[PDB]
Amino acid sequence: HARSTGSYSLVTQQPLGGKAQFGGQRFGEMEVWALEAYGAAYTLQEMLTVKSDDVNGRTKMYKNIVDGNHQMEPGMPESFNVLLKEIRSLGINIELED
Amino acid sequence: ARVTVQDAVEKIGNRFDLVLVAARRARQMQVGGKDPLVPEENDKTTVIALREIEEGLINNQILDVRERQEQQEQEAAEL
Amino acid sequence: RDVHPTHYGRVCPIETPEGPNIGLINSLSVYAQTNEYGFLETPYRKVTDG
Amino acid sequence: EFDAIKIALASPDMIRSWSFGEVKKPETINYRTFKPERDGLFCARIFGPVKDYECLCGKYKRLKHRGVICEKCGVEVTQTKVRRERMGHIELASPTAHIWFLKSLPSRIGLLLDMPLRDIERVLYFESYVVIEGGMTNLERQQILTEEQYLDALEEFGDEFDAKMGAEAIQALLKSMDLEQECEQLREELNETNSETKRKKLTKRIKLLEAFVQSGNKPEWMILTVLPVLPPDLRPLVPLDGGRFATSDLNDLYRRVINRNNRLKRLLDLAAPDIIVRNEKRMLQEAVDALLDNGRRGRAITGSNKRPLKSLADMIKGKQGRFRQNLLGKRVDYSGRSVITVGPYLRLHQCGLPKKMALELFKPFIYGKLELRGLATTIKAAKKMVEREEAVVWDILDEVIREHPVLLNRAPTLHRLGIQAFEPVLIEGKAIQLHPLVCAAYNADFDGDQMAVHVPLTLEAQLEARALMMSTNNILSPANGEPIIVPSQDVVLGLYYMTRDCVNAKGEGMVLTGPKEAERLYRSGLASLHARVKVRITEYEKDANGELVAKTSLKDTTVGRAILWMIVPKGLPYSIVNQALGKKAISKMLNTCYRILGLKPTVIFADQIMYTGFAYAARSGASVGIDDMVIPEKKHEIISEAEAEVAEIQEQFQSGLVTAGERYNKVIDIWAAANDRVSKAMMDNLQTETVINRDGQEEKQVSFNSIYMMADSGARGSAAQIRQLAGMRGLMAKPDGSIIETPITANFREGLNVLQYFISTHGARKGLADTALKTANSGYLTRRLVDVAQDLVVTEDDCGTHEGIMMTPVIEGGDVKEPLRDRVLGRVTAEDVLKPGTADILVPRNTLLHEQWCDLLEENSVDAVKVRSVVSCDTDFGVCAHCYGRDLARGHIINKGEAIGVIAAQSIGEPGTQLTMRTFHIGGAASRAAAESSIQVKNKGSIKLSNVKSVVNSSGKLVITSRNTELKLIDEFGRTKESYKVPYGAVLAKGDGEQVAGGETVANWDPHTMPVITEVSGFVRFTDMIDGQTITRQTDELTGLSSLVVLDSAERTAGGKDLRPALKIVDAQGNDVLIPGTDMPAQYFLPGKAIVQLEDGVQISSGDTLARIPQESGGTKDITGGLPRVADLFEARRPKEPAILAEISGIVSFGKETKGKRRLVITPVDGSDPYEEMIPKWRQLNVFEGERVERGDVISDGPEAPHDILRLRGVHAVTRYIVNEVQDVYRLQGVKINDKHIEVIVRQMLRKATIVNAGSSDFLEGEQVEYSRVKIANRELEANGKVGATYSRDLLGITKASLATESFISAASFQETTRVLTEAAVAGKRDELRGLKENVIVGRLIPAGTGYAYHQDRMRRR
RNA sequence: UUAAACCGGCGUGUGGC
DNA sequence: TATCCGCTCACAATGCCACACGCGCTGCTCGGCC
DNA sequence: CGAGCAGCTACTTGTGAGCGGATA
Ligand SMILES: [Mg+2]
Ligand SMILES: [Zn+2]
Ligand SMILES: [Zn+2]
DSSP, rough: EEEESSSSSSSSSOOOOSSSTTOOOOOOOOHHHHHHHHHOOOHHHHIITTTTOOOOHHHHHHHHTTOOOOOOOOOOOOHHHHHHHHHTTTTTEEEEEO | OOOOHHEEEEEEEGGGGGHHHHHHHHHHHSOOOOOOOSSSSSOOOOOOOOOHHHHHHHHHHHHHHHHHHHHHHHHHHHH | OOGGGTTTTTTTTOOOSSSSOSSSSBBBBSSEOOOOSSSSEOOOOOOOOO | OOOOOOEEEEEHHOOOOOOEOOOOOOOOOSSSEEEEEOSSSSSSTTOOBBBBBBBBSSOOSSSTTTTOOOOOSOOOOOOOOOOOHHHEEEEEEEEEGGGGGSSSSSSSSHHHHOOOHHHHHHHHHTSSSOOBBOOSSSSOOEEEEEEEHHHHHHTSSSSSOOOOOOOHHHHHHTTTOSHHHHHHHHHHHHHHHOOOOHHHHHHHHHHHHHHHHTTTTGGGGEEEEEEEOOOOSSSSSBBSSSOOOOSSSHHHHHHHHHHHHHHHHHHHHHHHHHHHHHHHHHHHHHHHHHOOOSSSSSSOEEEEEEOOOOTTTTSSTTTTTTTHSSSSBBBBBBBEEEEEEEOOOSOOTEEEEHHHHHHHHOOOHHHHHHHHHOOOSSSSHHHHHHHOOOOOHHHHHHTTTOOOOOOEOOSSOSSGGGGEEEEEEESSSSEEOOOOHHHHHHHHHHOOOOEEEEEEOOOHHHHHHHHBBBBBOOBBBSSSSSSSTTOOHHHHHHHHHHOOOOOOTTTOOOOOOHHHHHHHHHHSSSSSOOOOOEEEEEEEEEEESEEEEEEEEEEEEHHHHHHHHHTOSSSSTTTTSSSOOOOHHHHHHHHHHOOHSSHHHHHHHHHHHHHHHHHHHHHHHHOSSSTTSSSOOHHHHHHHHHHHHHHHHHHHHTTSSSSHHHHHHHHHHHHHHHHHHHHHHHHHHSSSSOEEEEESSSEOOOOOOOOHHHHHHTTOOOOOHHHHSSOOBBBBBBTTSBBOOOOOOOOOOOOHHHHHHHHHHHHHHHHHHHHHHHHHHHHHHHHHHHSSSSSSOBBBBBOOOOOOOEEBOOOOOSSSBOSSSHHHHTTTSOOEEEEETTOOOESSSSOOOOOOHHHHHHHOOOOOOOOSSSTTTSSSSBBBBHHEEEEEESSOOOOOOOOOHHHHHHHGGGGGGGSSOOOOOSSOOOOTTTTTOOOOSSOOEEEESSSOEEOOOSSSOEEESSOEEEEEESSSSSSSEEEOOTTTTTTEEEEEEEEEEOOOEEEEESSSSBBBOSEEEEEEEOOOOOTTTEOOOOOSSSSSSSSSEEETTTTTTTTTTTTTEEEBOOSSOOOBOOOOOOBBBBEEEOOEEEEEEOOHHHHHHOOOOEEEEEESSSOOOOOOOOOHHHHHHTOOOOOSOOOOOOOSSSSEHHHHHOOBOOOOEEEOSSSSSOOOOOOSSSOOOOOTOOOOOOOOOSSSSSSOOOOHHHHOOHHHHHHEEEEEEEHHHHHHHHHHHHTTTHHHHHHHHHHEEEESSOTTSSTTTOOOOOOHHHHHHHHHHHHHHSOOOOOOEOHHHOOOOOOOOSOOOHHHSOOOHHHHHHHHHHHTOOOOOOOSSHHHHHSOOOOHHHHHHHHHHHHHOO
């Protein structure tokens, strides 16, 4: 199975999983740790955030790659904003400083 | 092709500043539209940048020097 | 997960799925039969003195 | 873009600001049209438009009306994304308490109110009341009342008495609760009283109050007033056809909550009964605290099919929560997966990849390359062309994958090598081709494993995979110095068959002119592959400078290795190839090649090795046959002899001579000896029975058997496996581990019995389940260890601090466990290395020890080297470059930036595959013999004794009055090679510094009953032993001489408790003899349960045991010692019987007897004795009254705990013990791990510390503050004349280590999420995201690899 | 106002490594 | 009135992948602001 | 009239900490 761009979940902007639906594989946590053992901070933020998380960021990357520009802009992960909204939906406040 | 890059690290230490200099060099090669300092064999931009670093032509210091030269060129062009 | 010597002829020791559950999922032997109460019995040849 | 994240409590006004509309109806959406209800859960005027740039009524749909509201709905028309950030709230008529601060164990509201949890629980559920504004009444304010208590106490005070019930009463208590007055009152109370538990509780309370008075928080915010709801996009209602609907879990809870709230709001207006509105408030509170966290209530509610309704707390915790499923590990789009296949013609630096996968994974690259060429004007034409599968798309694919590396990945990732970079080549089919040599690095056979592949997709990513992830750059193991590119069974078998020479073959005794001539003669078939021939070789040797001396010389070698010489490069010598090639041989060959020739030619060398090995294994004839496995001739004879022996044993048992236990112990070793005999028989039958003549009589040789060819080369077969194959299978065992008495007298070549095979499969099913059930605990342990690790980054080059540890080889136990070099190769010394001659500095300070350095050290035979270590580092937030050592993978000094913590965790978590989860036994299933060991000394040297407290007897031996005396052997050079523990009062037949030969009995043992020595001669009397109170009359029946049995402390009554038996060594007159050098009266106070066999008025001799006190002979509490061993070691759990040691030096004495348990007084010589300890009575006592011991000495005999050891022996002692025991554990299995990983882990373990004396510092004495923080703070305090503080390090397990971190996100991803969340919320924590895991969850660069440098630029910019 | 272009949430069971 | 001893509850338990299925019927009562 | 509520288990084990408690 191989997927380039397919459907995305609506609760979290992330690709689906499985062969029935057009879903890619799941970059596991130990895989993130193995990347951390190496460098690849750029690679990590492209795979985790750009290639997986932000629809705005991933569309920008798609447009840049189909334009001949190996430039990346990570931005912020949308799922992290989802967790912020969850833990903010309780009596616990959380904010990002300057 | 380039099998290993250890000789790129023995002269550019820490194996991580090589990453930065290769990033900037290949970024100036792809979009900046500069000229490869060695006759390539029709390969990727990353590996020609790495190989130009390999011939002792590009490091971080000469990269900053070329950036300063480009800045002076911009100053002279703006006039 | 381990097999008892009482499984001789009633529970096959070499047939079990490898993975999450080993020994929890067994296979009934060939000649094994269920008992009236619900136990597992095995046929044996009755041997007299000679 | 943004700096540190701040977390605090939420105020109702902040929630109202967050909200964009109150939801007043539990109706979800309209029935006919799917527009949301006007003010239901789903809404548009509250959250946003359901369609992009389209309102609900459809009036405004163009771009001009973008940003204006309608006339009836009032919805700002915009995109759907707005329904993610915008949220609503629920206005509750009654307040409610937050369950997270109620049952957090410990709670936050209970500690704030100084009231336990049970009373608040009874109050909140309306079974009890609580009063407020007492005043003139007789009742206290903080007390609780029940229904009858509120009934009877209502008549005494009606107007001034206030008793609210429910969350309103709690809110009123929180509002009228002062903080500064409470703070000063608690400070005064802490200053007044003196207790342990009270002081701890007061410190916890004053810190909980300090977090409130300092940060901008309010207690009343703990009681919730408005329910913040979740956006609908996060809890969707997708169109499942029919009445059946695919829903989220939270929606039913919101429905129930809104229904209960509406019913409560309508009940108060109708003047409903008080008990009815009370039960309604109770139902609302239950709904609320089940919506916050279901399961923390006394009973978890459920929706359907007995499935508990998932809550918000559930949506965070667990493996399905965000922290584990959608934030740390997420699904990437570009990802292929397939089965692995072998490539025997591809180079090590490349790999294979299917065609369809290469097409699907690089669609945008193909699109760009097509748009660059004058082929496809638009992207739709290019998409149609790539979907039509034309031939013009193929050459573009060859162009885009010419130099585009990809990322190969394994599903279980243990170490950093599980992920690699590879240059793909297009192969037809649907499977991934992979290099066979790298497979051993993945630990993934070809039995159906599925591997994944990702694309870098970015310039930085491509060159990063090339630089730091290429397979060529990763050839050495990150754990030890052995190469991970070790050849596998096929190529090593081919090479072994090639270089294995015979006695007579085609072309024997001829002469060859070169390797090419040898290859030509072998391919021509005139000469065989193995023939002793005189050939000429031209080798190259490396000089001192960069030169290659070429020399041509004649050798007597085989044609096979002659052909193999064409593969070997010039620099390698010829002695490395002129051998019978084995696994270890070729491993050390590749190691030497990488050492001498570097990394550039080693890759192509190994590639050509694999090539020629596969080629000459294909041209080989290696195969197994039934004639290739012979049966030992004397096997049946040995079997029959063992049968006769066991029949004689059975006859002896039937005769009534031997019992069952000695029979069980005597049949097992007999059958084991028979098994060893038949194994040696099979082994000699394997290395012989093929004798071939060379132009004459028969001659012997290596005598292969085409299976011995496999087992001897170390390729795939072992000695024990082929031993079970051809010879006896061996003894089989039972579930518990009891080896059965009836072995298996059959082998694989012959038939087996049904019962034999039954026992075999019974023994093997458990071994199969071993790995399947152990991989779980292995993954859990490696997850815990990576969590505690990876909070460090080497950032300093050098610190100049010389605080290090002295590396000593493992000499305890056996003869030699591992040499010193393996513990020091690749380290930077703290103090300069000295030669065996004093004052000779051969190695200076702050330098890396290469191979030549340790070689010269071994030549000099240095015993102890003071090297720098991570545990003794003096750097804040990270380690120094010249403090760790070598990379163990790159032949140079460690670099600056790489996080060695991840490498350590992976190198100590990976070898768990070869470990055991549960063993048959840890130190032998048979009970350990009570001082019946027959160990001896092998080498010849001088004897040394540590902490010498011993005397000499009249028989010429040496007796010892101490326990911690260790014996050591200093060889003729000066190094220590042997060391052992000396028992109490052991018979030492030698002395100190005596040159004794190896193989002599040096010491004897005293049995389970403990002795006591007589340091000097004299007389003995019954001093302070009256007959009838402290001693009883028990007469012996086999000796006649009666033995006085002294009662213990638990059986004797109070009449004899105030009397302790003691022996006073006197002379013929009666005056006490003195200890030589001391004016202490010599008396030995006898403890309970003593067997006084010695009578009165007898002249005792020196070293003669007086009282034989019993002991636990066979009762041992040894640890299971498997992987649970390392689990307990990193958890630092207290053993069942911890041996309490001496914290302070000086004399010791006893105090009050049977105050629950026995006390212990330790009087030093400098100060007083303010340190007392309680001692259980079921353990043996080693130290006595007249014995003075240094701090760190034992009091009882048994396993030691690390907690006390850390504070009563130092920092280096506890970590040395830890690394020694963990190395013994890893060595009993046969896995090598460099200690540096354990050192850095245990360094991260002791990161916390406590304060004894605050001094001029701002930290209190009851604060567990991180060590580097107080080090930085005390440095400024030490700058002036004021004293800083008195810090004390404390060691805790790995579980609490990750939780006690100043960063909360790193702990929130770990277990125990709600507790750490509440702790960080009530304190107003602000973590500076200066870590690794937090930088991953936030999604930016990492301050370990590349981003580290970038983050430096970030640090200097900010 | 007009014209053109584009537009898997949960549980369960099984099996494999 | 302090100090251990025992009761009671929370929290946790490799990672992936593949496949498949099932997540109900009808009566009452309450919500009412298009 | 529509929607929501509701009526027709017993072997997990360890580890740990907080809370009686009992006993001088
Ligand atoms: Mg496999
Ligand atoms: Zn509208
Ligand atoms: Zn240091």
